[PDB]
Design an enzyme around this catalytic site. Structure first.
Site, PDB file in Angstrom:
ATOM      1  N   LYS A 137       0.847  -1.195   0.000  1.00 40.68           N
ATOM      2  CA  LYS A 137       0.000   0.000   0.000  1.00 40.68           C
ATOM      3  C   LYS A 137       0.883   1.246   0.000  1.00 40.68           C
ATOM      4  O   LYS A 137       1.345   1.674   1.064  1.00 40.68           O
ATOM      5  CB  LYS A 137      -0.927  -0.009   1.222  1.00 40.68           C
ATOM      6  CG  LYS A 137      -2.296   0.633   1.009  1.00 40.68           C
ATOM      7  CD  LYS A 137      -2.189   2.154   0.711  1.00 40.68           C
ATOM      8  CE  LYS A 137      -1.721   2.919   1.950  1.00 40.68           C
ATOM      9  NZ  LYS A 137      -1.574   4.400   1.719  1.00 40.68           N
ATOM     10  N   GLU A 141       9.190   1.238  11.482  1.00 42.23           N
ATOM     11  CA  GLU A 141      10.216   2.266  11.619  1.00 42.23           C
ATOM     12  C   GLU A 141       9.490   3.607  11.690  1.00 42.23           C
ATOM     13  O   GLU A 141       8.706   3.940  10.793  1.00 42.23           O
ATOM     14  CB  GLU A 141      11.214   2.205  10.462  1.00 42.23           C
ATOM     15  CG  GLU A 141      12.403   3.146  10.604  1.00 42.23           C
ATOM     16  CD  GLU A 141      12.129   4.508   9.942  1.00 42.23           C
ATOM     17  OE1 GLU A 141      12.205   4.609   8.696  1.00 42.23           O
ATOM     18  OE2 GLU A 141      11.798   5.467  10.674  1.00 42.23           O
ATOM     19  N   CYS A 177      13.871  10.025   8.006  1.00 34.13           N
ATOM     20  CA  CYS A 177      13.671   9.526   9.354  1.00 34.13           C
ATOM     21  C   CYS A 177      14.937   9.782  10.280  1.00 34.13           C
ATOM     22  O   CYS A 177      14.759  10.086  11.481  1.00 34.13           O
ATOM     23  CB  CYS A 177      13.306   8.046   9.307  1.00 34.13           C
ATOM     24  SG  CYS A 177      14.466   7.051   8.352  1.00 34.13           S
ATOM     25  N   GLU A 209       9.671  15.601  16.012  1.00 33.45           N
ATOM     26  CA  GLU A 209      10.143  15.445  14.638  1.00 33.45           C
ATOM     27  C   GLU A 209       9.390  16.394  13.701  1.00 33.45           C
ATOM     28  O   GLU A 209       8.157  16.322  13.590  1.00 33.45           O
ATOM     29  CB  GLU A 209       9.973  14.001  14.170  1.00 33.45           C
ATOM     30  CG  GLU A 209      10.300  13.807  12.694  1.00 33.45           C
ATOM     31  CD  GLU A 209      10.199  12.352  12.276  1.00 33.45           C
ATOM     32  OE1 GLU A 209       9.056  11.838  12.285  1.00 33.45           O
ATOM     33  OE2 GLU A 209      11.257  11.727  11.958  1.00 33.45           O
TER      34      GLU A 209
HETATM   35  N1  LIG Z   1      10.640   7.492   7.415  1.00 33.31           N
HETATM   36  C1  LIG Z   1       9.626   7.774   8.402  1.00 33.31           C
HETATM   37  O1  LIG Z   1       9.709   7.287   9.490  1.00 33.31           O
HETATM   38  C2  LIG Z   1       8.445   8.707   8.057  1.00 33.31           C
HETATM   39  C3  LIG Z   1       7.822   8.683   6.802  1.00 33.31           C
HETATM   40  C4  LIG Z   1       6.732   9.558   6.573  1.00 33.31           C
HETATM   41  C5  LIG Z   1       6.307  10.404   7.604  1.00 33.31           C
HETATM   42  N2  LIG Z   1       6.911  10.380   8.799  1.00 33.31           N
HETATM   43  C6  LIG Z   1       6.595  11.377   9.856  1.00 33.31           C
HETATM   44  O2  LIG Z   1       5.071  11.206   9.987  1.00 33.31           O
HETATM   45  C7  LIG Z   1       4.547  12.660   9.858  1.00 33.31           C
HETATM   46  C8  LIG Z   1       3.133  12.642   9.220  1.00 33.31           C
HETATM   47  O3  LIG Z   1       3.256  12.248   7.861  1.00 33.31           O
HETATM   48  P1  LIG Z   1       2.157  11.120   7.324  1.00 33.31           P
HETATM   49  O4  LIG Z   1       0.773  11.515   7.791  1.00 33.31           O
HETATM   50  O5  LIG Z   1       2.209  10.942   5.837  1.00 33.31           O
HETATM   51  O6  LIG Z   1       2.566   9.706   8.038  1.00 33.31           O
HETATM   52  P2  LIG Z   1       1.562   8.415   8.129  1.00 33.31           P
HETATM   53  O7  LIG Z   1       2.094   7.605   9.295  1.00 33.31           O
HETATM   54  O8  LIG Z   1       0.156   8.893   8.435  1.00 33.31           O
HETATM   55  O9  LIG Z   1       1.539   7.628   6.651  1.00 33.31           O
HETATM   56  C9  LIG Z   1       2.551   6.724   6.209  1.00 33.31           C
HETATM   57  C10 LIG Z   1       1.804   5.572   5.453  1.00 33.31           C
HETATM   58  O10 LIG Z   1       0.706   4.927   6.451  1.00 33.31           O
HETATM   59  C11 LIG Z   1      -0.456   4.971   5.841  1.00 33.31           C
HETATM   60  N3  LIG Z   1      -1.478   5.075   6.890  1.00 33.31           N
HETATM   61  C12 LIG Z   1      -1.914   6.203   7.440  1.00 33.31           C
HETATM   62  N4  LIG Z   1      -2.836   5.922   8.347  1.00 33.31           N
HETATM   63  C13 LIG Z   1      -3.009   4.588   8.374  1.00 33.31           C
HETATM   64  C14 LIG Z   1      -3.811   3.671   9.072  1.00 33.31           C
HETATM   65  N5  LIG Z   1      -4.750   4.135  10.077  1.00 33.31           N
HETATM   66  N6  LIG Z   1      -3.715   2.361   8.831  1.00 33.31           N
HETATM   67  C15 LIG Z   1      -2.857   1.913   7.936  1.00 33.31           C
HETATM   68  N7  LIG Z   1      -2.102   2.741   7.243  1.00 33.31           N
HETATM   69  C16 LIG Z   1      -2.143   4.056   7.444  1.00 33.31           C
HETATM   70  C17 LIG Z   1      -0.339   6.193   4.868  1.00 33.31           C
HETATM   71  O11 LIG Z   1      -1.339   6.067   3.869  1.00 33.31           O
HETATM   72  C18 LIG Z   1       1.093   5.994   4.374  1.00 33.31           C
HETATM   73  O12 LIG Z   1       1.050   4.963   3.416  1.00 33.31           O
HETATM   74  C19 LIG Z   1       5.484  13.280   9.100  1.00 33.31           C
HETATM   75  O13 LIG Z   1       5.499  14.697   9.162  1.00 33.31           O
HETATM   76  C20 LIG Z   1       6.836  12.695   9.703  1.00 33.31           C
HETATM   77  O14 LIG Z   1       7.067  13.304  10.952  1.00 33.31           O
HETATM   78  C21 LIG Z   1       7.969   9.597   9.022  1.00 33.31           C
END
Ligand SMILES: NC(=O)c1ccc[n+]([C@@H]2O[C@H](COP(=O)([O-])OP(=O)(O)OC[C@H]3O[C@@H](n4cnc5c(N)ncnc54)[C@H](O)[C@@H]3O)[C@@H](O)[C@H]2O)c1
Ligand SMILES: NC(=O)c1ccc[n+]([C@@H]2O[C@H](COP(=O)([O-])OP(=O)(O)OC[C@H]3O[C@@H](n4cnc5c(N)ncnc54)[C@@H](O)[C@@H]3O)[C@H](O)[C@H]2O)c1
Ligand SMILES: [Mg+2]
Ligand SMILES: [Mg+2]
Lengths: 507, 507
Positions: free
Chosen positions: A189, A263, A302, A403
């Site tokens: 996904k 992660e 990250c 973060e």
């Molecule tokens: N490398 C990393 O660790 C990483 C990556 C992206 C964002 N982030 C951090 O997270 C913050 C928010 O960004 P975000 O909203 O895109 O992160 P997120 O955790 O909401 O999304 C990451 C992935 O999870 C999916 N997802 C979201 N909600 C879900 C749920 N309830 N069940 C299953 N899957 C779900 C999203 O569609 C996406 O594919 C960012 O500003 C940053 O601080 C960290």
């Protein structure tokens, strides 16, 4: 030095379709309920194409295909699975520019990054796991003369994987190469902010894999992602992203009693000890570049080194070298290889960073550079650009604790080694750290003392395969980018065989 | 043949205190709020001693001691930690009878089991992990001429462990030996049904470990156990027990982002193919004993072979051999080495089994043997004894699907290999399986086809160290009784060291 034309314009290396499907059972298909969303480019804010807004019905259609494929795929020979991964790496490399421009367009980062880091590292990740599966062995040990324990690695079967938007294709490689090498079928996904790259890649590689082995379902986190994370038809769940969603993922796995790896980001310290100013001039420059590397991928990393800890005895001299590099950062069109910092990935992330810049001002953080939006010429004005920002403060401030995921570094000082270690570990995160000192004893002591999965020593932001990557503390559980991951994607079958024909004497 | 005197009577090898404390910071201490519960022996219903009904305050006082000891314990040399585990094993062996009688008294199982399995296996588990930590290595790999990845195993720090009552001391060894070998401090919560053995053990070994390295807090699952499982001051949680609590444990770890391993029971199938009746007479006897081994430990075994799958072509002939052995099971005083099946562990477990025998009658299961309480003479009349029970049925019945955890086997038949595999895998569980066939190809095919962590082939109920033990499906996540588990009790520190002094060329 070159500038790539925007996709679909004359001279462009790619033109995108107006609409993309899910990839299920070897083909692109529309969503079951026919709903789509529009993906926009962060380069200029303009729309790119439509992608499925999939629901539980699509996740279940993808799980049907994965489950029909799993037995034969799990029984495909190690040599054959390895060889397919080697062909995937070849296709990635043969299409390096096409994929790098696609990634820049969809995500916003500077194309020098996708040309030199993302795409080549993604191809190498497939060669690496193709190689590690050739080398993998279970075990055989004689417990006594007539009892032998065999341990055989087995595929988990069908696994679910949810990836974020900051390295769309590299994250996909990090997840897919080990899962496929281990003989699993995948339902992946991708992040709804960046659905395009994985679609282009599937167009390039889809014929290498049996139908149903690799399934890609587009959609929103709380719809498509949640159906996958709660599914009772997966053997394992993998996730990279935010801490609250990761904790939720682990709770979903807890309910179904399946293994999980996550992660979850960090607040990584880059620690600079005074002896570096007695080293070679090139090394001092390298250390200063190591601080400004915080702006790589617009800080959407990250392990972005978002806290710089500078020994106070060298803070004035060393920050002079740092600020020379911050000031020379070239901005502009992300498809210009000269550009060193691109667009943020989304308007939402853009808004998040600007909120944290205001919180920083309000709590007394002092601006040493940047601090505002970056206004760029022409079509770039509708995109999302922020200035590389350097804030002076102390570790107790919110911007030193939370973060941000933007091009923002908080810098503070320490008196001695003990204080550097205390500040470095004064976080709930523990994903990465940077450590700059030429004393072998300090390098080792600090390396062991920092509670983080990776301590980059006299470098930063190297993510080669064959170096394990993952969290201490709240940064997550599990490791990636290393053959030890294969165990997250396999199960251990213990055949405990007795060759004695006699009863034990108990019954 | 020997009969051990009841504890506290003339000739006994042990007499117990009337009251025991928690073990915290190197000494026995009372509960913070002074509440106690009474532990009774299931051999004869008579009380043993009082033990703390500990609260959250006691858990936090143990975590305080653990955290004060963790740094120095974690930095103690591998040789020294190994040598301490070796001394623990010798102390266990030096007190074999004392410990075996204690365990029978507290838990009810026949002393021939504690004398020959529990205590010697507990001693060997300490030697095994003392040896595996001597052999353990991290890694060093040259990524390129000036970049080296180092991976160093590090202790997690303070870990929580919750254990059940069916193997009180062996379970303690299974959890403590790897945790201590890895340089962690432990807060251990033993089952309130069986608090005694671990206290006697701590009296024998407590002086071998630094104060605070091993802390034992007695109490109820919902009170002391819950305080430990929800604690934000542990780096890892381990659990063996019921499915509902284990899922809750996994949810507690999810909330706190800590690694977790759980083993949650099973409904293990014992599969008998027709060719075994073409084998040697001794081999047929061994296979028949392998089915009746279900009554080892009164069936209170996560991998109790509680479903017997007999190829229908040999069902009459083979059940004659089985019933010969069922009829030979001697009941009596568990402190008599001639007793072959002891008492159930508690009234609640005793009553649970009796409920299932009742459910079995109502759903049409046919009694082939046993089926009622065992009414025993004299002081044993107040103990909990049930007859070894054999029910004929089919796999869809509740008693073939739900874990009973008493001396009860459901037997059913299959026509061919395909059917044996389908019935064997028709369960939510996946902890173990038994497999009896002398055709090398069928042994391998079924061994790979069965979804269970362990497939005993032509044996059953061997639990040596150096053979990985753990669940597929709902039986849990992680492995025990094997050196690979050390990774559940350690973090990987990646020192990624660059020896090149030049900048990368990005900033
Ligand atoms: N490398 C990393 O660790 C990483 C990556 C992206 C964002 N982030 C951090 O997270 C913050 C928010 O960004 P975000 O909203 O895109 O992160 P997120 O955790 O909401 O999304 C990451 C992935 O999870 C999916 N997802 C979201 N909600 C879900 C749920 N309830 N069940 C299953 N899957 C779900 C999203 O569609 C996406 O594919 C960012 O500003 C940053 O601080 C960290
Ligand atoms: N190897 C195994 O998985 C295993 C072991 C023992 C029993 N069982 C089965 O488990 C049941 C036995 O009854 P039980 O209630 O004693 O199992 P249990 O899992 O609840 O008890 C084992 C441990 O759980 C703890 N515990 C209970 N509630 C807790 C909570 N809310 N938070 C933290 N810890 C908690 C303690 O009671 C005990 O140390 C079934 O009767 C039996 O079939 C399985
Ligand atoms: Mg989100
Ligand atoms: Mg319970």
């Amino acid at each position: 030095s070159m500038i790539y034309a925007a996709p679909g314009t004359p001279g462009a290396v790619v033109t995108f379709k107006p609409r993309y499907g899910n990839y299920i059972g070897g083909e692109f298909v529309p969503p079951v309920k026919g709903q789509y969303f529009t993906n926009t480019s962060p380069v200029n804010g303009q729309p790119i194409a439509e992608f499925p807004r999939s629901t539980a019905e699509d996740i279940d259609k993808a799980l049907d295909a994965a489950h029909a494929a799993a037995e034969a795929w799990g029984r495909t020979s190690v040599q054959e699975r390895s060889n397919i991964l080697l062909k995937i790496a070849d296709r990635i490399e043969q299409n390096l520019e096409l994929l790098a421009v696609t990634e820049t367009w969809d995500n916003g980062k500077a194309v020098r990054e996708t040309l030199n880091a993302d795409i080549p590292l993604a191809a190498d990740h497939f060669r690496y796991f193709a190689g590690c599966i050739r080398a993998q062995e279970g075990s055989a040990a004689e417990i006594n003369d007539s009892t032998v324990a065999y341990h055989i690695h087995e595929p988990l079967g069908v696994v679910g994987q949810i990836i974020p938007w900051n390295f769309p294709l590299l994250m996909a490689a990090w997840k897919l190469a080990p899962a496929l090498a281990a003989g699993n079928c995948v339902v992946l996904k991708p992040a709804e902010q960046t659905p395009l790259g994985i679609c282009v890649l599937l167009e390039l590689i889809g014929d290498l894999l049996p139908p149903g082995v690799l399934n890609v379902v587009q959609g929103f986190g709380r719809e498509a992602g949640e159906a996958l994370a709660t599914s009772k038809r997966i053997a394992k769940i993998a996730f990279t992203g935010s801490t609250p969603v990761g904790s939720h993922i682990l709770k979903c796995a807890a309910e179904n009693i399946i293994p999980s790896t996550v992660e979850l980001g960090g607040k990584s310290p880059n620690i600079y000890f005074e002896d570096i100013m007695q080293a070679e001039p090139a090394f001092i420059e390298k250390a200063a570049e190591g601080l400004v590397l915080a702006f790589f991928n617009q800080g959407e990393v990250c392990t972005c080194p978002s806290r710089a800890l500078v020994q106070e005895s060298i803070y004035p001299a060393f920050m002079e070298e740092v600020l020379k590099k911050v000031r020379a950062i070239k901005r502009g069109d992300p498809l210009d290889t000269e550009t060193m910092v691109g667009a943020q990935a989304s308007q939402q992330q853009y808004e998040k960073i600007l909120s944290y810049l205001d919180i920083a001002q309000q709590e007394g953080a002092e601006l040493l550079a940047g601090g505002s939006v970056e206004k760029l010429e022409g079509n770039l004005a509708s995109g999302y650009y922020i200035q590389p920002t350097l804030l002076k403060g102390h570790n107790g401030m919110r911007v030193f604790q939370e973060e941000i995921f933007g091009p923002v570094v908080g810098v503070t000082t320490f008196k001695d080694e003990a204080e550097a270690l205390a500040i470095a570990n004064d976080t709930e995160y523990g994903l990465g750290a940077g450590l700059w000192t030429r004393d072998i004893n300090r390098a080792y002591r600090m390396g062991r003392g920092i509670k983080a999965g990776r301590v980059w020593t006299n470098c930063y932001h190297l993510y080669p395969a064959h170096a394990a990557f993952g969290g201490y503390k709240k940064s997550g559980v599990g490791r990636e980018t290393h053959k030890m991951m294969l165990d997250h994607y396999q199960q251990t079958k213990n055949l405990l065989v007795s060759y004695d024909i006699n009863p034990l004497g108990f019954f």
